[PDB]
């Protein structure tokens, strides 16, 4: 049997040949919405039930953004450059803190610890009272602060000090990484003198797993407030994080204005992470970075290559076709 047979398939050695029928093996996906991956739990926001909170407010323990983070095996990197929506003004671009939520989403299991890692009141530098702010209202609308940090303000003896050292213990269970959030406060000359007793720039360091840093505070002259509670403040904070690989302790060096670690993040396992955009609508068999959810109608696809999670078509360079029929046999 023969029919009008202009279909063209390629062979490894004969170049192109004409056949009586083909089976397309490839398709071209159309960009759509991200969706939950079918079957496997997919993480969007870190805390889907923490309303009027974003991933960086959850990561920092903002009052009223605390809660459980569901475990997930698949995560979508919604915000490339995470932002805050409340509490104390943070000079975010001075450190690497904006990426904290993008680190937490990379773990399968993420939980905030149950006990303070450091007794903040009794610590080097003398007895401290723990500071609060009107910008960080708690569940009874009183003045709170981030759950992960204690704003340690000297109770008395408001004098300048020498760098002090705290070894931050490992409190997570074996196999969990411990992510410690710490930082410092700074204010203008008048308030530093009234609040800490030392108006000159303060110095801070940290170390974990061989990785070290150093900060010097800024006194006065602060940048305009963004991404915060909306109340004016004369001061600002700098927030950073330290990652302690399982079994190791870390070290923090500080002078005045230290925000000491309190609750810490414990995390383990690995999520599969791709870039994407929320909301997740419906379900899909494959989540692709450029095309959103796909349902693998054909085993291969052409189009733009990108990362993907799930029962995905395999990207190929060209359209592919199998011959179904014989070579073209003109009606002669």
């Amino acid at each position: 049997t023969s029919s009008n047979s202009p279909h063209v398939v390629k062979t490894a050695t004969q170049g192109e040949v004409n056949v009586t029928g083909v089976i397309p093996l490839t398709t071209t996906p159309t960009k759509s919405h991200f969706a939950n991956l079918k079957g496997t739990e997919t993480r969007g926001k870190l805390c889907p039930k923490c309303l009027n909170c974003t991933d960086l407010d959850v990561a920092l323990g903002r009052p009223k953004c605390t809660g459980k983070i569901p475990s997930a095996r698949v995560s979508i990197l919604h915000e490339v450059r995470p932002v805050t929506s409340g509490c104390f003004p943070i000079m975010h671009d001075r450190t690497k803190i904006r990426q904290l939520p993008n680190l937490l989403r990379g773990y399968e299991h993420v939980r905030l610890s149950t006990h303070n890692v450091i007794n903040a009141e009794d610590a080097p530098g003398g007895p401290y009272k723990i500071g609060t702010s009107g910008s960080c209202p708690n569940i009874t609308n009183g003045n709170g602060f981030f759950a992960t940090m204690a704003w340690a303000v000297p109770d008395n003896k408001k004098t300048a000090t020498n760098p002090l050292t705290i070894e931050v213990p490992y409190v997570c269970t074996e196999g969990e990484d411990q992510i410690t959030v710490w930082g410092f406060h700074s204010d203008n000359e008048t308030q530093m003198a009234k609040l800490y007793g030392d108006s000159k720039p303060q110095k801070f360091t940290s170390s974990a797993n061989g990785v070290t840093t150093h900060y010097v505070s800024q006194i006065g002259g602060f940048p305009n407030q963004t991404e915060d509670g909306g109340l004016p403040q004369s001061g600002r904070i700098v927030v950073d994080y330290m990652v302690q690989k399982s079994g190791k302790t870390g070290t923090i060096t500080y002078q005045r204005g230290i925000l000491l670690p309190q609750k810490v993040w414990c995390a383990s396992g690995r999520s599969k992470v791709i870039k994407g955009s929320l909301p997740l609508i419906g379900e899909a068999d494959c989540l692709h970075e450029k095309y959103g959810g796909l349902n693998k109608s054909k085993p291969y696809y052409t189009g733009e290559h990108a990362k993907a999670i799930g029962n995905c078509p395999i990207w190929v360079k060209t359209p592919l076709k199998l011959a179904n029929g014989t070579k073209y046999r003109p009606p002669a």
Binding site: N4, N102, L322
Partner: protein
Amino acid sequence: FLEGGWEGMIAGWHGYTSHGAHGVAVAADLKSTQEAINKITKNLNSLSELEVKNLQRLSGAMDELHNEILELDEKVDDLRADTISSQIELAVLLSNEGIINSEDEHLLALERKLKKMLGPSAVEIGNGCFETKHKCNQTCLDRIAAG
């Protein structure tokens, strides 16, 4: 009508033509027809069954902070994409080369079984449609098409 081809029905996509003096008896071998379909189905599935691991982001590599690592990660994903595409293309191209070059064996095999059924009475050239030394009617041809 049966040889060469024309714009007729191709519903049984039949592999051989009829022969004989009884007008033009026509019968199809539907065992052969099903073999061809089942054979392509199996080939399609061995290709659609290819599974490779998918690529994702490094969980510890943060944007900006570790931009250099990420540049390498993109390089790795991109080189991998060429590699997998090339393996697929070769698997498909070899599958097609094999299909294209199976055309003559299928047709020769069909003529050989006609000789088995009809006996050592004749030879043919060119298209090679076996032709008998005796008349064979539609009932005869149906028995042949059916074995």
